Amino acid sequence: QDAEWYWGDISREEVNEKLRDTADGTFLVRDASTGDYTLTLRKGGNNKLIKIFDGKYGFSPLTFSSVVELINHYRNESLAQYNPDVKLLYPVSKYQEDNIEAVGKKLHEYNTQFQEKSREYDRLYEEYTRTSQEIQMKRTAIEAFNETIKIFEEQCQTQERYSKEYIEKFKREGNEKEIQRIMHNYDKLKSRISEIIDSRRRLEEDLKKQAAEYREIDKRMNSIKPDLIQLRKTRDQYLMWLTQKGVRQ
Amino acid sequence: PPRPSSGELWGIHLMPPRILVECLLPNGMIVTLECLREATLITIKHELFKEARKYPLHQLLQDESSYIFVSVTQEAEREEFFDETRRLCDLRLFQPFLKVIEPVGNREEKILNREIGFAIGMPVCEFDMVKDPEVQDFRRNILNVCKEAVDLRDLNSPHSRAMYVYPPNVESSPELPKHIYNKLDKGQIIVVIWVIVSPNNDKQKYTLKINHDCVPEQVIAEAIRKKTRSSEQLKLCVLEYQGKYILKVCGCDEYFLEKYPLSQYKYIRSCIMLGRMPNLMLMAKESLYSQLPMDCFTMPSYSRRISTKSLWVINSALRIKILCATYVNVNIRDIDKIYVRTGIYHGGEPLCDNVNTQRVPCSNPRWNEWLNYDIYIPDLPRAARLCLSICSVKGRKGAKEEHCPLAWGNINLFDYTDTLVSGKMALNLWPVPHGLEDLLNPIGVTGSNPNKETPCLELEFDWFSSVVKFPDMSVIEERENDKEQLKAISTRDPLSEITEQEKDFLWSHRHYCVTIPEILPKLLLSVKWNSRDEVAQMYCLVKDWPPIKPEQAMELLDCNYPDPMVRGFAVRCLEKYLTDDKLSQYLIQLVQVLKYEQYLDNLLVRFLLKKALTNQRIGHFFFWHLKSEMHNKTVSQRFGLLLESYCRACGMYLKHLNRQVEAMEKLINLTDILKQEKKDETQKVQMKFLVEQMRRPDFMDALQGFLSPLNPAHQLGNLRLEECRIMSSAKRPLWLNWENPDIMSELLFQNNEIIFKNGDDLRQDMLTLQIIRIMENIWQNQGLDLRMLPYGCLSIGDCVGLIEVVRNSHTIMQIQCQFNSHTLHQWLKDKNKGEIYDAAIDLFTRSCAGYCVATFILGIGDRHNSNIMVKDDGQLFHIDFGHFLDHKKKKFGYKRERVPFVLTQDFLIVISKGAQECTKTREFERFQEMCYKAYLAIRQHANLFINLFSMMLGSGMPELQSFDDIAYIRKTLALDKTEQEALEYFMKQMNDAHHGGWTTKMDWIFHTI
């Protein structure tokens, strides 16, 4: 009950958060999710659940006076004697404001800061998602412009190839008014390729701008994501101390 | 690539009534033609070739009919417009231009490929491009499944062809529950058989009293015997000769084509429970067989085109070099250093400890570091993956440092050809999912991000003088105290704790486990997957493992069982034991678990695709579940390739699906206008716009005469334009209705009311409504008539969906519009006055109990007067299932299971029929017993619900990211307690939330009354 590694009514999910990315040997004892205790040991990237079972305590032919005796024994001796293969190296200690009023006022403060920060983060995500969608749209339209420009250029190439002999013919025939018709159309064509090329160029600018805007949105999110996590842990730490400081069931 | 929007042009939702189109003549000339937006290409081409004579070089132009039009579409594709009956507004043009060309190449292939491209939401030519050998291999090898399914479909033609299009909608068992059988008159049903009599198409009744277990042919025999007699040598001759008719449901496309007891057909089964008259239609087999066009499959063009060391011989540990990352988006001021976190995973379980690179500055992401793993190369399991991320580290708050992932990426250690990775590799990393705080994402997909303007990690794998291949499967193959403990472990839920002692016990008794096949998932997690010798032994056991129930096989398909032998075993249990009924029921989950597959080509994808191509009801929802996710770049290649092969082989259903796809596109576009350019407009002005737009022939052609994506058995005929409106809610939902064109529409559904919503994600609602359906099915099977209402809901795209409207219903807040607490009961009394009052209070009580238990178990969004609806006949239901499970844990650190549906005085007054002291009545006691049985019936089937939620973990649903999110139903179902303690707990939550009224009534000691 006074042991640092003993936590009480903490869930398997609470233990998981405590053991998340911990070194091999990291352990803590809690009450069984239902044999009244459960030891959790960090081994090979995983959390190993070992049941503590009489007048005696043990895992296996029980032979221990208390839970502290069973733990402290394996805290100095490798678990290899039971099965292999690591010692209970690092305990998760239940040890790291004066009044309920001071704690309560700090809780209200952190809970306000947290609700502010979580609403901001969510709005940054929607801004991020929309910028991501728009960048995708612009890249697709540039590809469509590339294909459109190719067609209008094939039309110039085709117009040139077909009119060459016809304009040679009309030059001889003194039909300058017909030459002026072929040229006026070809100019209408070239102006249009100029308009499309410019439109693609302007979109290429917009994309470079919005790509830089996405980069900054991602930067902003990467800075507030860690603060949001710690503020939530603090907020949750204060709720815990408030429950404990207050009258219990 | 896919279209940005559903607009008529790029950056323009609607074309103006008249538009100038640049026409590029084959003589190199350009004619700007003014066209009507709705004009067909036939019209535009005729008007162009008339005009072209007023332009130079006109003599060089062939006959107007020697050419077609080509243009660039919004998908950036060059599309040849062979179907000149299409309107200009429907071409999905990028810019208003058309190029005149002579048609070349294979017309039929190009047309089909365009039809597939339209349906799957991307041009099929984008696949021919893909350099990945795995991709090209999937496209060729999947065709074997296509040919196989088409052959099985065209085998017993026309009966096998009719069974494909109109599969029997039947329950999994002919067994009728006690309360269902008692609803029958001595095991007999009163059926109405209708006939459409020529030449006036006059409707003639025939009431028949027959055994519930009568086969459809037997029902036709009673009708053939009643339509002639009310002799004997003649009747026998007449009945035997006249077995050339079929039964159909009046008002919808549901047929009774297979020899199943009439009562096993869901429609008939539904009629008995509801106490409704079954209305069937008798039509000749010839009338139906001749309405079935030929579904021919063609092998595509891409199908007709042009020193290894074993892993076990590699005596070394695993090491991977992290070289560098191109960039990372982090501001140097806020973050101290960056590093690469890596792990070797088998499913979600690491095979050894995670290893990091050294910390480096934000500006210089270079590591040039070999990471050594505590795993021997021959000990790598077949499903071994490298899960990595680039993380930021910021201290500054004492000795407390904050670690955050920046981008993640996963890779299979073996490719689809069983080759171990080697040499250099570039991996484009993915954005961290919103809500994910874990530094690695092992549940995330494998492969590089297709978007290359993203952080790119450089890696290097070892070279072993040759190509290392995973060893062959032949090479791999080289008490009562204990019986009671095993049975107890096997009855435990999929997520229950397994102690190290229990793992060791299960491994030690592995050969005896075969005697209890259902313990297999528990035994598979007990295996040390980092030991080739343990795995080899598990392989020999799984090969000869006895079959398990399909609901247990589905567990071996989630993210916890990545092994191909385990997964192959699972797919085979589904192949032999999964009813088409349950496959349709679990399709949402079965589609989702395709994201967990290591490779494109696998047994699951082959099983689902063969089923989609042999049953059109499965094919319909299989297509829509894959299509709705085509925006999601993590699965769009996999799903696009799967959709291509489905569309390529589904036959005529492609024509129908494309009509649905185009109806939906017009609705997406119409709502985008209302939400964007017209957002500040009034309801009257928006309504005037909708009325004008919906009257246009282009709109009218697309939105009339197609099948409902909610239920393809329902035909959507002509629109009822006077009943179509923009709803008052924030994202502009459209309330639509269509005539039912069925000759007998009067009998089933004269109305086809659907809400179209563009703006919110409907996936969670769709999952909740599926669960409510499965829960209600559990209750009915157990004799509990708790009537639920899982109304139609289908996600059809990215935050785009359909909701089936429930007719003759009102919200509590609508009913309340007088000020009272008796208002609800008074409203129900006035709707059900007389003899029918008792039936309404029963129905209200039963529906109330079901919703009370369902919403509590699921932890649904808070109930209120706008969220709760009541039908005219008393039936209560809930709407808006946008939230579930532990949605308030992160927001408010509070730990208490909410009671979303608190039965206030209003609902109590109804249940107790107006009586003062509502909790003290015999009607309230009866209602409590309903809740109790309903609660325990779901707890008894907890494995199913846990598995269904476990199968959805990679879906991208915000409130379903980890197994920790599923832990909520473990709490509400009190799965770590005894059944008796769990009922006590439910009673306690009901009591706490209602402030008294629910305590014991049995004895607390033994629970006997």
Ligand SMILES: CC(=O)Nc1cn2cc(-c3cnc(N)c(O[C@@H](C)C(F)(F)F)n3)ccc2n1
């Ligand atoms: C006569 C009548 O009114 N029947 C009726 C209405 N009704 C509404 C829904 C439904 C479900 N989920 C939602 N999220 C939702 O939301 C609304 C606000 C909007 F967004 F669609 F407008 N509505 C489902 C069935 C149903 N039947």
